[PDB]
Amino acid sequence: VTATVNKADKSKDRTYKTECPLEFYDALPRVGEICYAYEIFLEPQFESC
RNA sequence: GAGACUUGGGCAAUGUGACUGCUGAUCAGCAGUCACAUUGCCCAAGUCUCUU
């Protein structure tokens, strides 16, 4: 904060890293190990023509 | 005690000369701070338009 001259280029933007969630962090099955198949459902809400 | 004189004492009134501080009013000269105003350098920041 003592660097009060920080108003010169306050429009500067920086980069950041990204990371997948813990569950998605290497959930790949191993041969011989238990696997969880999570079913996907697509229920229609709109009434069709 | 009074009248007057002599000296002295007491009180009072008023004036005169000098001193030490205290303020009052006016005037000049000087410094500093704060604020406003003029435009510009000016980046931040949002909106908007063009467009990047």
Side-chain angles (χ1 to χ4, degrees):
Chain A
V1 65
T2 177
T4 307
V5 76
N6 214 356
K7 294 287 294 295
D9 64 336
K10 219 174 79 177
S11 176
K12 186 189 53 201
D13 295 331
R14 292 164 46 219
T15 60
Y16 312 92
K17 201 203 59 177
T18 67
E19 181 178 10
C20 75
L22 192 139
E23 284 95 325
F24 270 27
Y25 184 71
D26 196 25
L28 176 75
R30 270 66 160 264
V31 54
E33 284 189 354
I34 297 90
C35 309
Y36 323 122
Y38 274 102
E39 188 173 355
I40 308 303
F41 310 81
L42 276 80
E43 317 181 24
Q45 311 314 290
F46 85 106
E47 181 64 25
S48 162
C49 78

